[PDB]
Amino acid sequence: GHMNRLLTSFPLTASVRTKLHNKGFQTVGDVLELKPTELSAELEICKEEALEIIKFLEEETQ
Ligand SMILES: [Zn+2]
């Protein structure tokens, strides 16, 4: 519902905030565009850590 909210306005872990910024992600929609395996490939993390970001932004923007 709030796909255009900035990722920096959420209390994501410091480590994943750094990874999102360094790989060029800006908004909720930039993350929620992707499945866990797609997001983990881009951020160079494992699938479960990608799932975690996705599920948290899904509940927070709804
Ligand atoms: Zn895209």
Residue numbers in the entry: -1 to 60
What text does the study give?
RAD51C is a central member of the RAD51 paralog family of proteins that share sequence homology to RAD51, the recombinase during homology-directed DNA double-strand break repair (HDR), and with incompletely understood functions in this pathway downstream of the classical cancer susceptibility genes BRCA1/26.
Consistently, crystals of apCX3 with both full-length proteins diffracted to a low resolution and determined preliminary structures lacked electron density for the RAD51C NTD. In addition, we solved high-resolution crystal structures of apRAD51C NTD to 1.6 Å and nucleotide-bound apRAD51C CTD to 2.3 Å. This data is consistent with the apCX3 core complex adopting the same structure as the human complex in solution with the RAD51C NTD flexibly attached, in concordance with our limited proteolysis results. Also, putative Holliday junction resolvase activity within the N-terminal region of RAD51C was proposed, albeit other recombination intermediate resolvases have been identified since.
